[PDB]
Amino acid sequence: TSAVQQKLAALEKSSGGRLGVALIDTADNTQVLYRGDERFPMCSTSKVMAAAAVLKQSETQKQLLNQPVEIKPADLVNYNPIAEKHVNGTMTLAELSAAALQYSDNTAMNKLIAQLGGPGGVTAFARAIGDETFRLDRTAPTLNTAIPGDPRDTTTPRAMAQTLRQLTLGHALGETQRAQLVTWLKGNTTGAASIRAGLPTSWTVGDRTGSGDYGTTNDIAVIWPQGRAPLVLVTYFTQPQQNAESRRDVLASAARIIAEG
Ligand SMILES: *C(=O)[C@@H](NC(=O)[C@H](N)c1ccccc1)[C@@H]1N[C@@H](C(=O)O)C(C)(C)S1
């Protein structure tokens, strides 16, 4: 095991939880993995797959992103910071995708899922781009139960890192779609204390966070250092106590360790 893996193992030991990390350095397509093949609950990081699946649809339905979607009182769930502003009005699928990706809006996630025909349509898009690991089984917010050992709504760090690379830096999407996903991710507002907090602050970052029960605290990021090929970093973390507190600092610390090596 490398020096970076020993430092990640020590961070994990210090934290009392279970840490999964996958880095892809696209300059060499080298990988750094820590529990990279173990399953973790994705929580809201699954929003990237859902938004990208709608973007993939928009390659054929050219005006799909401007299609209005009604926001109704029954659509509201546990956390709806943007959609609650539009109850009994409408939001476009673009406005819903931005709400999901930039504010972690769970109503917006559910509208994306509905546009895809259910959670099976999100998983289908994962399989269509070569991700055999991702599975989405539930809508928001029950996809965040993060129960230890439950295979529902999980992926592995290695698989999520590979998928995030193909969506944002590869060509799993069309050029306008991929650029739109990059813009949305760069504009995320919920990640300041997660991967972003452990990285040199002249690196541009796009990321999507997630949180759930068992103190599950997740972040997935595409990172553009200046003068270097970009990297993809996935950091997943979960804890033994059902009511455990969020630990965004562990994700920052993992990113910092990765950025060193
Ligand atoms: C996705 O992770 C979403 N999580 C939830 O709705 C959870 N039920 C939850 C966990 C902890 C606190 C509140 C809700 C949304 N994304 C989260 C995130 O980006 O970390 C969230 C906490 C903003 S809600």
Author numbering: 26 to 57, 59 to 238, 240 to 252, 254 to 289
Authors' account:
The CTX-M β-lactamases are class A enzymes that have a broad substrate specificity that includes penicillins and cephalosporins, including the oxyimino-cephalosporin cefotaxime. Acylation is facilitated by the transfer of a proton from Ser130, via a proton shuttle from Lys73, to the leaving group nitrogen of the amide. In addition, Lys234 is located near the proton shuttle residue, Ser130, and may act to lower the pKa of the serine hydroxyl to facilitate proton transfer to the nitrogen leaving group of the β-lactam during the acylation reaction. Structural results suggest that the slow acylation by the K234R enzyme is due to a conformational change in Ser130, and this change also leads to decreased inhibition potency of clavulanic acid.
The structure of the E166A/K234R enzyme acylated by ampicillin was determined to 1.6 Å resolution with one molecule in the asymmetric unit. As anticipated, the structure reveals ampicillin covalently bound to the enzyme via Ser70, as indicated by an Fo − Fc omit map. The C3 carboxyl group of ampicillin also forms hydrogen bonds to the side chains of Ser130, Thr235, and Ser237. In addition, the Ser130 hydroxyl group is oriented toward Arg234 and forms two hydrogen bonds with guanidinium nitrogens. This Ser130 rotamer is the same as that observed in the E166A/K234R apoenzyme with a χ1 value of −60°. The Ser130 Oγ is 3.6 Å from the leaving group N4 nitrogen of the β-lactam ring and at an unfavorable angle for hydrogen bonding. In the −64° χ1 rotamer conformation of Ser130 in the E166A/K234R/AMP structure, the serine oxygen is 5.7 Å from the Lys73 Nζ, which is too distant for proton transfer.
